[PDB]
Design a protein around this ligand. Structure first.
Ligand SMILES: Nc1ncnc2c1ncn2[C@@H]1O[C@H](COP(=O)(O)O)[C@@H](OP(=O)(O)O)[C@H]1O
Ligand SMILES: CC(C)NC[C@H]1CCc2cc(CO)c([N+](=O)[O-])cc2N1
Length: 246
């Protein structure tokens, strides 16, 4: 198994649905942030060392390639952070892998990000996310790795993440840079709601007969998940309420 598709889209642009869509097409697993959170939290420290390596004055690219290969062993595709921040490196390791850029309205994206991924430091909901994540075993190590991977994607060392305006422009610039960096034939821009048609054509497969395009991971469902984790203090006791998520 080798990487066939590199998902460059940022969190909250439909990466989980694209993960599930690629798993349907290929019948093999696709990486995602939820693979880390719910299945392999030991990957956190690996991603952290890879991101740190990029910050050095002289970066060892083969250390980065080796780490990515270990992390993605057994996977047919990647989506979401932290992997999307390494799309240039994954394109080079896998020159025949195609690139998908999931994209959506920038203002819908910011709202979704503030609800699930990156609340402002002054938002009291931030404390609820953290309390729910604690039930899952997620701690400060994860938040540092995830934040560092977002900053790496945005190619900034210092960033005021509480500034909505700076996030909007980093979002536009990132999506613009992907389309500049990736050769046109090697890239599909998949807008939210685009469904099977353009994706299957791009990947040279047929549209899955009788299987609807996934619609997973809404901020409404994530808000409920956080609340049920806080209430019941157990993922196992609540997962029956969240089918088709993890
Ligand atoms: N098939 C689909 N059609 C429309 N929106 C979708 C979708 N699949 C996922 N989404 C939206 O994409 C966002 C999740 O993206 P990601 O998996 O990268 O975190 C959610 O947005 P909202 O938070 O606005 O509901 C979710 O509703
Ligand atoms: C899945 C839910 C329950 N856990 C919340 C996670 C959700 C995943 C997540 C992702 C990032 C970056 O992609 C950051 N971040 O910007 O530090 C935080 C988080 N928090």
């Amino acid at each position: 198994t080798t990487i066939q598709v590199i998902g460059a889209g940022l969190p909250r642009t439909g990466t989980n649905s694209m993960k599930k869509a690629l798993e349907i097409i290929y019948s093999k697993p696709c990486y995602h942030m939820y693979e880390i959170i719910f299945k392999k939290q030991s990957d956190i420290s690996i991603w952290q060392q890879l991101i740190d390596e990029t910050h050095k004055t002289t970066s060892d690219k083969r250390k980065i390639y080796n780490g990515l290969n270990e992390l993605l062993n057994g996977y047919i595709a990647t989506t979401d952070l932290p992997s999307c921040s390494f799309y240039k490196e994954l394109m080079t390791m896998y020159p025949n892998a195609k690139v998908l850029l999931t994209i959506r309205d920038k203002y819908d994206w910011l709202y979704s990000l503030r609800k699930v991924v990156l609340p402002k430091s002054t938002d009291p909901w931030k404390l609820k996310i953290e309390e729910g994540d604690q039930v899952l075993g997620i701690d400060s190590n994860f938040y540092k790795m995830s934040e560092d991977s977002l900053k790496f994607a945005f190619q900034k060392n210092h960033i005021n993440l509480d500034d909505d305006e700076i996030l909007l422009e980093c979002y536009d610039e990132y999506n613009r840079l992907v389309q500049e960096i990736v050769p046109p034939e090697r890239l599909l821009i998949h807008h939210l709601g685009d469904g099977w048609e353009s994706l299957c054509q791009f990947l040279n497969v047929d549209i899955p007969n009788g299987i609807s395009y996934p619609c997973a991971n809404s901020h409404h469902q994530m808000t409920q998940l956080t609340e049920q984790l806080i209430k019941h203090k157990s993922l196992d006791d609540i997962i029956h309420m969240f089918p088709g998520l993890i």
